[PDB]
From a paper:
Improved maps were then obtained by focused refinement of “upper” and “lower” volumes of the complex, the upper volume encompassing domains L1, CR, L2, FnIII-1, L2′, FnIII-1′, αCT′, and insulin and the lower volume domains FnIII-2, FnIII-3, L1′, CR′, FnIII-2′, and FnIII-3′, with the polypeptide without the ′ symbol being that which contributes domain L1 to the insulin-binding site. Resolution of the resultant upper and lower maps was assessed as 3.2 Å and 4.2 Å, respectively, using the gold-standard Fourier shell correlation coefficient (FSC). In our judgment, the resolution discrepancy between the “upper” map and the “lower” map likely results from flexibility of the FnIII-2 and FnIII-3 domains within the “lower” part of the structure. Strikingly, the fibronectin domain modules, i.e., (FnIII-1,-2,-3) and (FnIII-1′,-2′,-3′) are no longer in a Λ-shaped arrangement;5,6 instead, they are folded inwards in a pincer-like fashion that brings domains FnIII-3 and FnIII-3′ into contact. The association is effectively symmetric and occurs between the canonical C and C′ strands and EF loop of FnIII-314 and their counterparts in FnIII-3′, involving residues Tyr849, Arg851, Asp854, Glu855, Glu856, Leu857, Leu859, Arg875, and Ser878 of each domain. The (insulin-free) domain L1′ is observed in our structure to retain an apo-like association with domain FnIII-2. Furthermore, domain L1′ has here, on the surface of its central β-sheet, a large density feature which we interpret as likely arising from the αCT segment seen in that location in the crystal structure of apo IRΔβ. The density is, however, poorly resolved and its longer axis is offset somewhat with respect to that of the αCT helix in apo IRΔβ. Taken together, these latter features suggest a partial destabilization of the unoccupied primary insulin-binding site formed by the L1′ + αCT tandem element. Residues Cys647 and Cys647′ and their respective disulfide-bond connections to β-chain residues Cys860 and Cys860′ are relatively well resolved in the density maps.
Author numbering:
A (entry chain E): 595 to 647, 737 to 770, 774 to 888
B (entry chain F): 4 to 160, 168 to 266, 274 to 310, 595 to 647, 737 to 888
Amino acid sequence: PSVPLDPISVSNSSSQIILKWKPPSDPNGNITHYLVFWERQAEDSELFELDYCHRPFEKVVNKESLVISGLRHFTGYRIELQACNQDERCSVAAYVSARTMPEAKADDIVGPVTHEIFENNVVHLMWQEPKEPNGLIVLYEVSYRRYGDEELHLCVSRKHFALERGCRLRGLSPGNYSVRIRATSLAGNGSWTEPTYFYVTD
Amino acid sequence: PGEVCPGMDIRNNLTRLHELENCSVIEGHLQILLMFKTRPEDFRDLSFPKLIMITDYLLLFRVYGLESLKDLFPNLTVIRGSRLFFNYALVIFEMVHLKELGLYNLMNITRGSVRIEKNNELCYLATIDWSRILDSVEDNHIVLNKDDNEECGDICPNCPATVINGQFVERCWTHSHCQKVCPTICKSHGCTAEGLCCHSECLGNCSQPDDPTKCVACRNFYLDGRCVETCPPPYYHFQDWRCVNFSFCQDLHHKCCHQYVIHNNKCIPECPSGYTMNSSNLLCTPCLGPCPKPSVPLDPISVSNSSSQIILKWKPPSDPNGNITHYLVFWERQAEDSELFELDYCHRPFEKVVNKESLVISGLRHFTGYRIELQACNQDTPEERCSVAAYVSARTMPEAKADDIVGPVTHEIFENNVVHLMWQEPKEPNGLIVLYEVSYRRYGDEELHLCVSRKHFALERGCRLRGLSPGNYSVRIRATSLAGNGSWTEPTYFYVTD
Ligand SMILES: *[C@@H]1O[C@H](CO)[C@@H](O)[C@H](O)[C@H]1NC(C)=O
Ligand SMILES: *[C@@H]1O[C@H](CO)[C@@H](O)[C@H](O)[C@H]1NC(C)=O
Ligand SMILES: *[C@@H]1O[C@H](CO)[C@@H](O)[C@H](O)[C@H]1NC(C)=O
Ligand SMILES: *[C@@H]1O[C@H](CO)[C@@H](O)[C@H](O)[C@H]1NC(C)=O
Ligand SMILES: *[C@@H]1O[C@H](CO)[C@@H](O)[C@H](O)[C@H]1NC(C)=O
Ligand SMILES: *[C@@H]1O[C@H](CO)[C@@H](O)[C@H](O)[C@H]1NC(C)=O
């Protein structure tokens, strides 16, 4: 049979993929079913090392759309669609690629924001990284703030964060400082952590 | 050095691919397609390092398991494009699993363009500067690849770096192979590792400089281990790349398919129109008599290659209903997006184009949008009747140093040890400056930042750093405009008393 026509890969949900297509221009026989193959593409090795500072299938009978469920959030997938008119002699494949949606709170940081202060008044911050994120987390932003002043920032990269095990603020003048934290992943910006306060003794 | 083999169309399995074992030149095309049962293992120990040049085109279509060409064709240097695939000499299409090209010896594509489409894993594309490899990149078609939806961390090994259109980026083919860049005088001849130009008859690479017997490939024609400008008598040009004698063309003729003939010192498949095969000497000779046997202008495209030049192109109206006399180009400056000043991010000059279907508009403001109205006229003299307008919009390029901050970085210190910084804003920038970044730094520590918005900067008249611990601090400043990042100011130092 002819090639399946007009495939469109759309993702309306974080787990659902809705593949749509028109039937082959030349079925040359009574079409029995379609044959959808999907395949996870592995994540890019190099993304973990940069400083920014048979497969499950389905035979679709009498239908021209499919909703693929139970799929990993914000991940690219190779979809191979074929048509069969006897159950094998099937049409040449129709390739299409689709990237799933991210999750809502995958990048949001939970649990207590902890700190330590050393004999030299350095503040070693520690917070638990969001265990299961959208793809991976490419960096973090440390936003400390002294009441009344303007906002300050700091990009903490993967290698830095994973090495120190959180952050380390060296030599700040005394006072009560306000902190907000915002995880930056491949997908976007995980919601700002509620303001914490810490007072470095005078 | 190796043999010259004819073109191949290799399908289903890799078996027939081993017929290429000793080929150094493919006299024809190479098509590789429809291999659904091939696996990575099949290519891991599969290599053709002898292959240097292909005279027609290279096409790769639906080849499963192949992740790179760096091991298949490590020395492929030139694609001549004698025959093309829809005007393309290189086609890499729907190569699912291919992660990189790795054609680290490919220096020149003499004719035709590159079409790389629908390769969902293909990276190491942005690091290749195709303008160094092809004379015209305008007809390239590089779309729907992984490279587009920027997930490629194309990290080069030391490699040379060149500018794209503002962005200075390092150039490489793979994680382990840099892209070779020769001195500008050397361009098509190629060069050695030390940078000495190859001989003028070489193409792409040579083993020793200024020696026409040590070329990797020839610029014009190849004959008897030497690159020659033309085939001298009594030899004939064959397939626009090699010199052959009369006897060879004659043997081909008698084996035939196409029964080869000689014309204009070339051995060609058939006589051109109006000429006929003089049997004896195989020479095409001419036959006496027969041989015995208004609407809208279409598709406007606005392009800007310069900070001041705009190159507008268009097709004529589908129904001219008369002889078109001229075109009428109008341009008009759009001022600037009102909200940009109130958000915190922390007759017109014209031209009558006669006998031409393109215009280059000069003396235009940098990084500015423009409304261009194009019309067509097919009479001008008594009372003009012209076409309905063709609307098109284009944004000019930014300037190089428009956003760079000049003049002394000045400071003051108050009784409460607050440091009021003051520096002159870049008077004429690319559009406008949307914010600034203040980067103070204590020697040894990590970088610190501060986003200073427009209203803030304009109010305070520079910056104001409140309550810093004593010491000598280093400062860098970076203006951020609508266009990009005005170069970091050289490190200044200031010492706050203890
Ligand atoms: C390669 O393909 C041909 C074409 O049908 C087939 O006859 C041959 O058996 C195949 N060889 C292998 C090793 O798959
Ligand atoms: C390549 O050359 C070697 C040299 O002896 C020969 O054994 C081999 O058969 C050749 N390969 C082909 C495909 O002709
Ligand atoms: C490739 O070589 C030809 C032969 O002289 C030359 O005309 C062309 O400009 C070269 N292409 C480049 C340098 O991109
Ligand atoms: C030219 O070919 C030689 C052959 O080994 C190779 O070592 C060299 O790197 C090549 N030079 C360029 C610029 O490709
Ligand atoms: C832009 O193209 C025009 C048309 O050929 C040319 O005259 C001009 O020099 C080009 N400018 C740049 C910067 O390439
Ligand atoms: C400005 O940003 C571009 C983005 O790629 C970068 O290449 C360039 O080096 C930056 N300039 C400075 C002075 O940091």
